[PDB]
């Protein structure tokens, strides 16, 4: 034979389907990578700028005055709106402990939802990077099984007749490893990025929570004591 | 053939590049290990002497007068400063429970952030220790496959004309495992050491929380019930 | 020739693999013996202490029971932490504060004792999970040296492959001998540490219930003559 | 032919290939059934959640979800909140009411998760023990081959090739039966987790509505 560009041609039926299935796996891996990488870089840059602007907040009104201009798909604006909307709905309630508990609960749900939406896509990468070595192994086990069939039937010697069979059988697992290397590299990259992003988001949410709690306490005190 | 080192330059392009990639991965692993190991040792030592010094503080003011000279990068001084910061930002409140809730929230955020800032290169270590045997096996399979393609194109039924190719292939595999195993044991070592140091930080933060709670409750029980 | 003569004429790297794995085995067995004796003694003391404190009925009575449990008694460190908090918070009139701080300290210290018990388990886990790959490195070196051998000469007999096969068998045999007891022992010790941490948590819970019950009763009696 | 060597194997490779083909058939039956059920339940719950996100009180929420069927998980959750509010009548500790309600709702969400994960036991067990039953088939095949090589002392290693063919066929069947088990199991684990979080969000919505109503009503009744 000559190379993979010629060996894939006359390989087999089931070995050829294994090779095509693994090529499709690799293509979907690189598509996932490109899309998620550009979106992650965009979102993380935006949120890091917004947190650096919010770090100079001393009250929830001042934080809304800062973040009045953060576009419309800014996670920071969504969290500040959860806090403000809870304060709006509970207008008429005199249980500031209740207000704080409700807002903590809403922000917990919202940060979890953003985490899951960011992570959506990594199941493909995990399962590909985990099982493509085994699909390659099945391709080579079938190739070698057919090699032994060919040796048994019309009995022959001189491995110069079986060499193309073993070449075809190994090519399957070579494509397997080629398709399961970038899946694991990309999966680890994105696990680290998602972790860092969920942590930064939790920091912004905790900032909102501290601002609201501190404001409620100081208001109740300065209104009841004097 | 000749030797180990006299048989890594005579391999094909794919196998040579596989072996060079694995050697660079092993070098990166050892540099990461040495740097982060001296760092962890230093940090654990400083924190232990700080915790010893503080374990004999009865008030938050006495703890802050002990830690008035721990330095600038002192994790313990950061925690005491966060406790004092919430307590002086909420000045005017009367919800001691609110003050303690904000303080505990902030200190646990800070402890977790230090943990994640310590686990920095471990992504490199895990990726290397997970994909390096695969790069070794891609090398060995490409080597054996090239060897059989050559044996079929040359039509030589011997085995002495094919043994060196298999030698270099299995060499690439052994180097794959050499680059994999140390990375994995060092990743486990660093995960354990990071867990231990995070428990030590948790204990210092717990000390701060108890000092603050006692201070607040004793101040209240003295000023309200003479 | 025998297995000893097989080891004597193996490659340098295969001999270093085998030395590393036999030393890993020796450290596994030293760990097993030390940790086994310490677990037996610790769990015996603790079980006796808990079965004594099952009849406490009050924190003062529990203190007078455990007043002489030696000094290594974990069930004495916990009682003295509850009492130490109840004494550092004298003058405070908030009882929920006292209960909260005591519970915090006791969870803290139970976690500390657990982390001290699980000391060496990291090493056992590392060996038991890695050693098959050091064995496989030895095997691959053995096969590769067999092939360099059959390439040096031009023939392929049993005599030219015997060295590679000796290496491939011996290296992975010691791999298995060093990775089977590491897994057995790591598992028995993880199970025993789980059991002991549970027993310790149950004594901690006794201390918490006694303290809290006593605080509530004394406050009720003080507020209602 | 691949089908002509299934009978060639003698006994304990044939009764391993039958076992693994049955395992694969059961795997795919489980997949089709559970996947249709998950799609249906997730569609219904998503419709009901985005239909309830426009409710401002528990009264209006029961008005909305008055007709969601009977297998409606959102209806189960709303009725547990209202059942708690009804059993605790005559009480005055609204914090107690909220505590008990949240307790029951969390128990209920976990119960629905566990009731959905029913069969993933088979998927896990098959994905774990199928490569080993295949490999036991192949080791038995090669052992039987080397035993047959000694009775008739056929010193040629060109005629015992079908024995190794059967051994490797048992291993390939082991992998065919073992890989879809692992893939499908991971997919179902992940999909159950996602649906469980969406259900937790509907539960959180019920909890927020109840708490808000309780506090508003108590404050209004205390301060006329």
């Amino acid at each position: 034979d000559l190379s993979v560009w010629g060996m894939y041609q006359h390989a087999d039926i089931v070995v050829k389907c294994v090779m095509i299935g693994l090529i499709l796996a690799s293509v979907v891996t690189w598509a996932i990578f490109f899309s998620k990488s550009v979106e992650f870089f965009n979102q993380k840059r935006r949120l890091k700028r917004e947190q650096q602007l919010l770090a100079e907040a001393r009250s929830l009104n001042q934080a809304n005055d800062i973040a009045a201009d953060f576009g419309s798909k800014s996670l920071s604006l969504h969290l500040l709106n959860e806090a403000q909307n809870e304060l709006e709905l509970s207008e008429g309630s005199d249980d500031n402990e209740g207000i704080k508990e409700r807002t903590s609960f809403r922000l917990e749900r919202r940060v979890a939802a953003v985490g899951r939406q960011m992570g959506r896509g990594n199941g493909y990468l995990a399962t590909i990077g985990a099982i493509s070595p085994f699909v390659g192994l099945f391709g080579t086990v079938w190739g070698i099984m057919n090699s032994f069939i060919g040796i048994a039937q019309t009995q022959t010697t001189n491995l110069a007749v079986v060499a193309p069979g073993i070449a075809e059988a190994l090519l399957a697992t070579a494509i397997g490893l080629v398709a399961a290397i970038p899946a694991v590299v990309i999966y680890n990259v994105f696990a680290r990025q998602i972790g860092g992003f969920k942590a930064m988001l939790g920091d912004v949410a905790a900032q909102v929570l501290l601002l609201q709690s501190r404001d409620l306490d100081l208001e109740a005190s300065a209104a009841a004591h004097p | 053939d000749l030797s180990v080192w006299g048989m890594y330059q005579h391999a094909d392009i794919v196998v040579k590049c596989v072996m060079i990639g694995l050697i660079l991965a092993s070098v990166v692993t050892w540099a990461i290990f040495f740097s982060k190991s001296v760092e962890f040792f230093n940090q654990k030592r400083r924190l232990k002497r700080e915790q010893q010094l503080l374990a004999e503080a009865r008030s938050l003011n006495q703890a802050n007068d002990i830690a008035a000279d721990f330095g600038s990068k002192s994790l313990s001084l950061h925690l005491l400063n966060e406790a004092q910061n919430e307590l002086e930002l909420s000045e005017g409140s009367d919800d001691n429970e609110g003050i303690k809730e904000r303080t505990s929230f902030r200190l646990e955020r800070r402890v977790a952030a230090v943990g994640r800032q310590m686990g920095r290169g471990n992504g490199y270590l895990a990726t290397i220790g997970a994909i390096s045997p695969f790069v070794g096996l891609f090398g060995t399979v490409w080597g054996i496959m090239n060897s059989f393609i050559g044996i079929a194109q040359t039509q030589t039924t011997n085995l002495a004309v094919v043994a060196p190719g298999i030698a270099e292939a299995l060499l690439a595999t052994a180097i794959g495992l050499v680059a994999a195993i140390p990375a994995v044991v060092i990743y486990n070592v660093f995960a354990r050491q990071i867990g231990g140091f995070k428990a030590m930080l948790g204990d210092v933060a717990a000390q701060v929380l108890l000092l603050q709670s006692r201070d607040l409750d004793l101040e209240a029980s003295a000023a309200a019930h003479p | 020739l025998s297995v000893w003569g097989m080891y004597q004429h193996a490659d340098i790297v295969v001999k270093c693999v085998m030395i590393g794995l036999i030393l890993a085995s020796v450290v596994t067995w030293a760990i097993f013996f030390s940790k086994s004796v310490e677990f037996f003694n610790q769990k015996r003391r603790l079980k006796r202490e808990q079965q004594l404190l099952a009849e406490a009925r009050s924190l003062n009575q529990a203190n007078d029971i455990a007043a002489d449990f030696g000094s290594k008694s974990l069930s004495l460190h916990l009682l003295n932490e509850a009492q130490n908090e109840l004494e550092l918070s004298e003058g405070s009139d908030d009882n929920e504060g006292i209960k909260e701080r005591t519970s915090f300290r006791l969870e803290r210290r139970v976690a500390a004792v657990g982390r001290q018990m699980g000391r060496g388990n990291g090493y056992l886990a590392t060996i038991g999970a890695i050693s098959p790959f050091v064995g496989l490195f030895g095997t691959v070196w053995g096969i590769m040296n067999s092939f360099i051998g059959i390439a040096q000469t031009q023939t392929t007999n049993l005599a030219v492959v015997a060295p590679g096969i000796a290496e491939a068998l011996l290296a992975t045999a010691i791999g298995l001998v060093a990775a089977i007891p590491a897994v057995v022992i790591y598992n028995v010790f993880a199970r025993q540490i789980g059991g002991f941490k549970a027993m310790l948590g149950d004594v901690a819970a006794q201390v918490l219930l006694l303290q809290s019950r006593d605080l509530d009763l004394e406050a009720s009696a003080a507020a209602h003559p | 032919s691949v089908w002509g060597m299934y009978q060639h194997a003698d006994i304990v490779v044939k009764c391993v290939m039958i076992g693994l083909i049955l395992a694969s058939v059961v795997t795919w039956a489980i997949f089709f059934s559970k996947s249709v059920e998950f799609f249906n339940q997730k569609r219904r719950l998503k419709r009901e959640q985005q239909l309830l996100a426009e409710a401002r009180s528990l009264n209006q929420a029961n008005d909305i979800a008055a007709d969601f069927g009977s297998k409606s998980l959102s209806l189960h959750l709303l009725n547990e909140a209202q059942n708690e509010l009804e059993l605790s009548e005559g009480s005055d500790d609204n914090e107690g009411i909220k505590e008990r309600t949240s307790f029951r709702l969390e128990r209920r969400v976990a119960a629905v998760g566990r009731q959905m994960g029913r069969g993933n036991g088979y998927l896990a067990t098959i994905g774990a023990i199928s490569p080993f039953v295949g490999l036991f088939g192949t080791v038995w095949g090669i052992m039987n081959s080397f035993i047959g090589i000694a009775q008739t002392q056929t010193t040629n290693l060109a005629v015992v090739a079908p024995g190794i063919a059967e051994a490797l066929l048992a291993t390939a069947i082991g992998l065919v039966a073992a890989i879809p088990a692992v893939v499908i199991y991971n997919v179902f684990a992940r999909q159950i987790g996602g649906f469980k979080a969406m259900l937790g969000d509907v539960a959180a919505q019920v909890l927020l509505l109840q708490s808000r109503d309780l506090d508003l009503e108590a404050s209004a009744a205390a301060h006329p």
């Binding site: 086990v141 190994l170 | 992504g123 270590l125 895990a126 399979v141 | - | -």
Partner: peptide
């Protein structure tokens, strides 16, 4: 930060599977 892959998985049975085809017809020829 994430559920990373730190596993060291090596399904290279395919190699020793090809090594054995070699030695099957290598000596008896």
């Amino acid at each position: 930060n994430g559920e990373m892959h730190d596993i060291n998985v090596t399904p290279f049975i395919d190699v020793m599977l090809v090594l054995l085809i070699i030695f099957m017809v290598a000596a008896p020829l």
